[PDB]
Amino acid sequence: GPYAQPSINTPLPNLQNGPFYARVIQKRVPNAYDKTALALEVGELVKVTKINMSGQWEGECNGKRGHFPFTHVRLLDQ
Numbered sequence: 001g002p003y004a005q006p007s008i009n010t011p012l013p014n015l016q017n018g019p020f021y022a023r024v025i026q027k028r029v030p031n032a033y034d035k036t037a038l039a040l041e042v043g044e045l046v047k048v049t050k051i052n053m054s055g056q057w058e059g060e061c062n063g064k065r066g067h068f069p070f071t072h073v074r075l076l077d078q
Contacts, residue, residue: 003017003020003075009054009055010054010055011055011056011057011069011070011071012048012070012073012075013048013051013057014048014049014051014057014075014078015048015049015050015051016051017078018047018048018049018077018078019047019048019049019060019078020047020048020075020076020077020078021045021046021047021075021076021077021078022045022046022047022048022059022073022074022075022076023043023044023045023046023073023074023075023076024038024040024041024042024043024044024045024046024061024072024073024074025042025043025072025073025074026042026071026072026073027039027040027041027042027044027046027068027072027073029041030066031064032064032065032066034066035066035067036058036065036066036067037064037066037067037068038059038061038064038065038066038067038068039061039064039066040061040064042072044061045061045062045076046059046060046061046064046068046073047059047060047061047062048060048073048075050065050067052067053067056068056069056070059073
């Protein structure tokens with residue numbers, strides 16, 4: 001399946017696909033205390049490795065972990 005929501009209403013999942021690296025283009029600087037969110041900036045990268053929930057997933061960015069829509073990541077080739 002192409003890396004798109006394969007009609008499952010599931011944004012860029014990966015792990016199954018990569019996990020792909022993904023260049024974040026809009027993330028906050030949170031922490032794992034914060035909902036478990038990804039501390040990174042626009043232009044940084046986040047690696048989506050955790051396929052969970054029924055829609056959005058958890059990335060792991062060189063030691064940040066958390067969950068966040070694809071609506072602000074570009075991806076890379078794993």
